[PDB]
Amino acid sequence: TLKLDTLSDRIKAHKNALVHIVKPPVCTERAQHYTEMYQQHLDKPIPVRRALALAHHLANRTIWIKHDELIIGNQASEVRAAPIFPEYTVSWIEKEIDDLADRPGAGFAVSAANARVLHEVCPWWRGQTVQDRCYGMFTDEQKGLLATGIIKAEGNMTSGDAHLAVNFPLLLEKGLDGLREEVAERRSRINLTVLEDLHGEQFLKAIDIVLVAVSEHIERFAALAREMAATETRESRRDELLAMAENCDLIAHQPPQTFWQALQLCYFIQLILQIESNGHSVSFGRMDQYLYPYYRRDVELNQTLDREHAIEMLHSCWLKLLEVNKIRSGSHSKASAGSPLYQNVTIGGQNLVDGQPMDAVNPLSYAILESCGRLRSTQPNLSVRYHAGMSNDFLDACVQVIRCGFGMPAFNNDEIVIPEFIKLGIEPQDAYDYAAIGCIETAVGGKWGYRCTGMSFINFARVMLAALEGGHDATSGKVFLPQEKALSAGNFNNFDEVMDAWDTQIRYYTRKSIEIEYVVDTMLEENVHDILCSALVDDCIERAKSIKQGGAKYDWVSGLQVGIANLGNSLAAVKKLVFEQGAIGQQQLAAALADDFDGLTHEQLRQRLINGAPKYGNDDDTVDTLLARAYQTYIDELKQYHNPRYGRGPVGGNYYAGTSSISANVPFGAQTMATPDGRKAHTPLAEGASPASGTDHLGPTAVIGSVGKLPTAAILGGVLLNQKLNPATLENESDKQKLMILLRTFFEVHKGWHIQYNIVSRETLLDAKKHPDQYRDLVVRVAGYSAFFTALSPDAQDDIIARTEHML
Amino acid sequence: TLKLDTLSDRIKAHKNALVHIVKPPVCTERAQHYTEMYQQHLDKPIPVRRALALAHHLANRTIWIKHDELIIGNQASEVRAAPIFPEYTVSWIEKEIDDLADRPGAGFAVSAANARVLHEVCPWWRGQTVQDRCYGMFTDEQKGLLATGIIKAEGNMTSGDAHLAVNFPLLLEKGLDGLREEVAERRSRINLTVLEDLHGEQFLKAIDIVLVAVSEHIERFAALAREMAATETRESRRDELLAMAENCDLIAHQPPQTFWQALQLCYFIQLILQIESNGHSVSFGRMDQYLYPYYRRDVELNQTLDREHAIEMLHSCWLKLLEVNKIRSGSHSKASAGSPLYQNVTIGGQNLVDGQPMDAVNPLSYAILESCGRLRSTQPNLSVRYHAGMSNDFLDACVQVIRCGFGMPAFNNDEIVIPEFIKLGIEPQDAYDYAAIGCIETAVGGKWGYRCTGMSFINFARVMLAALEGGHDATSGKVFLPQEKALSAGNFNNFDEVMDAWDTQIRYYTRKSIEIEYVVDTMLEENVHDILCSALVDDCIERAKSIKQGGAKYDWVSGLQVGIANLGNSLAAVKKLVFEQGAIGQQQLAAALADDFDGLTHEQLRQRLINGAPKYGNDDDTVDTLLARAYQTYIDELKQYHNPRYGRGPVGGNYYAGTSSISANVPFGAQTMATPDGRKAHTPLAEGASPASGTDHLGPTAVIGSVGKLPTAAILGGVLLNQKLNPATLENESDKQKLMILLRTFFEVHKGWHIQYNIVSRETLLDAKKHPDQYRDLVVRVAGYSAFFTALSPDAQDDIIARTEHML
Ligand SMILES: O=P(O)(O)OC[C@H]1OC[C@H](O)[C@@H](O)[C@@H]1O
Ligand SMILES: O=P(O)(O)OC[C@H]1OC[C@H](O)[C@@H](O)[C@@H]1O
């Protein structure tokens, strides 16, 4: 009974207000205060100094209540403005503050007034930021691998970690006051003549400062809700505000009672975590499961609320998550097209009750979905947990919201995740509780460390280019791991010798990436403790230490490998026309590539490369499994390493692979020279594990075939897959059953990680590229998340216009 | 064959030049550079940043060669000037820089020019110094115990640690280059994907920077030795300088060959360790044992050198140790009268060879002693290792140098130390290798952490005052550990109930002292790694971490308990006239003490206290063993604690007691109100474990009897004992045998820790108080060390005139 076409004047009023905020400003309050507190409390341990900085900023910053919201709590002085966090870096800010209103798709209105506040702070943080200090440690060799871009890790060096969901049931069952009580018994057991206890109490001291200021904050919003009602003349909203301060008074301290309370609270947390740290992908976890016992109480039974005012609340909320904005560098902005935050909300899945698995779909799962389908907004990121025994009813209701052309909902697959989690050591009832984090990755909400994916980026295409030409990276002229065999010298005797070169080179860029990651993570852990986040994850409080120090019950991280499709395609093409057939010569190719297929003779060569050799995504086994092998070397490397939290507390403490590379395929391509699959220099790579655009000619069931052949179980950082259909292709009920049997076959027979759809027509993308001004709420799906189309650059825009359009 | 009366014009020229440096200046170079490097390398790990600071300062500072020295290497731009080290503190410097040329016995000429350099640096170090940060951590309660002075620890909060001897045999066997080789193999085994190895390599990186700059420095003194010989016209010294650059060239790199080389090298180290850190009591250890194989080669056999030019070299050296100066606060200066450095040189003892103990006295032991006896200088601090089988010849030669009236040599006692070391876990052949450190304490040179004594000060007299009056400290009006029983309320039922109050109060000031020490030591270990010192102690290089982190093979520390005599005397007096006899009333006493024995009635009361009750030091068992018990509570407390290095590497990791309190008895007295032993308010306490001045009336054999009854074995921080005789009392050979049988009986029958003599007449102390100007090389012994008498304040001067003068 899905009524997906009807908003309300209240929420239509807001959503538009926001989508027209087309060049956001830069609220600078937090970088003002945090410098003060770092200047006033230089003598404190960093966990306490940071707890003060936050408690200061929290009660000296502008707060307001616009748009007649049903949910309240702003990230910044000005609407949709992006705070400034100087602890992680200043370097890209001391290069780029003039050049910021005109930045191809990451433009920030930087007021002459708030620019004054920036020249003032900045030069003091120089030398003492995470990024500055990473460079204080890096070995010289590490420093070159970074300059080139072969291994990239800007995102960890210029931002907090985040990439997790905190323990929202805890927060709800105890309320803040019950966490002070948790903290109090814990510092009751501290002994100050025991080294480890001496450090443990600084971190516990810090937690209490933060917990405190947060209660105070919730009350200084109960404050406004009444000081506003004073000078307010429209009765109907005063009766709302009075209930909100009435509802905020009760959530600043005790466990919440209603639905309106248990969802304002969880937002309050979800916010402060993004004011204390700029890490993106603060997820929500299984919200349809932990807000449900209030939805049931309130509106299903006692019916003191109406199932339609529940759906209106969430909306206000969804729009507050849209309010959350964040500014990134010029370089990293390219790989994060459309300033996203990836705040993920998870619905569905199973639920291990007393040892037996049980369908977890419930009436709030339908209410949450149906509220997303009506709103058509980038936020939240809606991720649905499929399982073999999901209803036909709910899956059809998922296909209904897909035909709404904003990319949601996306799918994750209990059929693959749960058995692999159990298989790593995760507690069986925790493996059933996994959520989506950020984009397509998966963790156990409330019990996992940071970055279940999101660690360092490796460029598979550039590395393979080096395995072909004597270890030489053509982009930068460097040779980091020398070797004799190169194409230009045509002295590979057989293809297996090319595959060896690959196994040899990647084994050395993986070591480096881990050495680099070891520095970053160690700098992040000495300088920037996330106080509140750590309070709200198990088992920090009991171990009295931050997540980065080993506070989390579980801890697994993944990197991101970019260039998947191009690696398969390249190897398979030099395998066929160079070795197998002799059609093309080693030097003839080497000269081809060092030339960017230039001339007319070299162009014929490229086209024989593109179409005279099997491409990944046509259910062709020869290329598909060649790719799985090439990747398998990388997965085999990660096994002889342990991440920095190994042995210091958590379970697991290891790595795995991951393809959730956001829009890094574009700027990563610009750094990759011509490649043997026929790709020209600088053009884009392929995003995620999707097929390279325009090479998949045997339709969608052949695509999922190819994708499902990758070693999914070792790639628990997510296997990203984009598909695009035309709106007329998915139109009748006969077309809907086609999508459904396609999904059910992906997840059950093939064991797929994820799939997300773009239901857009190719002319609509093209009128919005042209007339932005009548398309400023059009949502298209990028890769792991949704974006406002008019907001992406044109590089970003056309990668999305180039993708294959499939029939069902 | 001791010729103790003959210097040389060369060395007489120098010694006088120095003793007239009567208000020293403040060379500010090092605080200039170190701020630069902390400002240029803010991004480095602290171990590397500090290694740079040192390598910078080391090759940008004024260096010279005055006085026609046979040993070269200056601590500072100006002669006898005191560098400035801002890392440990600035606070006492931002209060006291105007008020510094007139400071009762710690006056520093602070040039208007070098005062300019101080206002410039200082305000940047604010908030980031050891002291500033300790206060960033201390619990509020900890902070009050500190304000009062009941527990004091200024010396650890405003200075490096030191209080050790580094591994001088190593340095000599390998030379610097062989330590680069040591360091190189060590970083060869580093793995940069292993957390502990990632930190290990920063510390190893740092060590190499320092090692390097030190070789460079030794060569930039080989530089001067020739650039001077150029513009030099007195042939005879050019032939010396040429050999010194000739000898410095060989010691900047390789293991030294001669005696002149092996003793210039060890000085070079002994110096740089006092430019990198301001910790005092950089000792030398068993120099008569590790320089001897060169003395033997050179002059005993091959005779290429003359036993009289060896004795002239050491002299130059002794005078370079006198050149070493250090500036301290206004408060801490009082407890360190006569700006000393306590650089200790140890001679004699035994020597466990292949499992059998053997006399270690040798011909360099006689040469070192005889060179001290001729020179009559505060530096070095000469400590002799007695054992039951020491010769009559060498002991008489020790008594000869005593009749020289400069306090040296002092005595330590293999008969007590070795069996207690073995008994703690120390390797048997290391227990035979123990040296003296600083004053009277004992450690295993090259294998021990910092502060075998020198940790936190406790005031036994003030604490006992609190056990008498309801936990009330009368000095400051505070009550830190409340209790009902007080004298003013006369409600002790029996004396055992007073002893309980004592056991209860001290058990609580000991906990606090350890909590305080835990903060200081942790701040010292996060902010101020001693690079070179750590390189030269086992087993830092192998564990790749500093001493403070657990680098040292062995690690035991002691505090200092001040007020020993007064505690015994007080308890024994309230035991006799209050309880036992009823002669005096509880309130009558309480009112007595709260009054500073004022009136004429209260004065009779005091005199019955002084002389109507047994005092410690008359071989009286009742008071002697009452004191040992009172102290025994404190020793029993230390057993349930472990110092911060417990479990992190070293052996032992524990505490023990100690009485080596330097001149803290005076300023500590000023903070202690009238006490039941008859002492008036503010007057001095008793220094060390000596008898309270003027209460020991049955002569020296009765004194050593009393002292020997203390629990010596648990007091391995040293039991300090001062004795003073008149020069005519120790004059004939019949008088010498009296001193010798007194010593041999102390150490063998009583098992004494230490004894040192003042052979001065009471009129000589009084003419030098009056006519300073004809007495500026008079040395008198303070407590653990020697001082120039005209340099001590008058408070200091008269504590020394008040001591008992004994007959033999
Ligand atoms: O380097 P960054 O921006 O921190 O990592 C980017 C990550 O953002 C979080 C997403 O869940 C993941 O798909 C993506 O890889
Ligand atoms: O607090 P400070 O000055 O570091 O300690 C003073 C110490 O100096 C080192 C001496 O060996 C010891 O006798 C004395 O107690």
Curated annotation (Swiss-Prot), chains A, B:
<keyword id="KW-0456">Lyase</keyword>
<dbReference type="Pfam" id="PF01228">
    <property type="entry name" value="Gly_radical"/>
</dbReference>
<dbReference type="InterPro" id="IPR004184">
    <property type="entry name" value="PFL_dom"/>
</dbReference>
<feature type="domain" description="PFL">
    <location>
        <begin position="9"/>
        <end position="680"/>
    </location>
</feature>
<dbReference type="GO" id="GO:0016829">
    <property type="term" value="F:lyase activity"/>
</dbReference>
<dbReference type="InterPro" id="IPR001150">
    <property type="entry name" value="Gly_radical"/>
</dbReference>
<keyword id="KW-0556">Organic radical</keyword>
<dbReference type="Pfam" id="PF02901">
    <property type="entry name" value="PFL-like"/>
</dbReference>
<dbReference type="InterPro" id="IPR019777">
    <property type="entry name" value="Form_AcTrfase_GR_CS"/>
</dbReference>
<comment type="similarity">
    <text>Belongs to the glycyl radical enzyme (GRE) family.</text>
</comment>
<dbReference type="GO" id="GO:0005829">
    <property type="term" value="C:cytosol"/>
</dbReference>
<comment type="function">
    <text>Probably shows dehydratase activity.</text>
</comment>
<feature type="region of interest" description="Disordered">
    <location>
        <begin position="675"/>
        <end position="697"/>
    </location>
</feature>
<dbReference type="InterPro" id="IPR051215">
    <property type="entry name" value="GRE"/>
</dbReference>
<protein>
    <recommendedName>
        <fullName>Probable dehydratase YbiW</fullName>
        <ecNumber>4.2.1.-</ecNumber>
    </recommendedName>
</protein>
<feature type="domain" description="Glycine radical">
    <location>
        <begin position="687"/>
        <end position="808"/>
    </location>
</feature>
<dbReference type="InterPro" id="IPR010098">
    <property type="entry name" value="PFL2/GDeHydtase_fam"/>
</dbReference>
<feature type="modified residue" description="Glycine radical">
    <location>
        <position position="784"/>
    </location>
</feature>
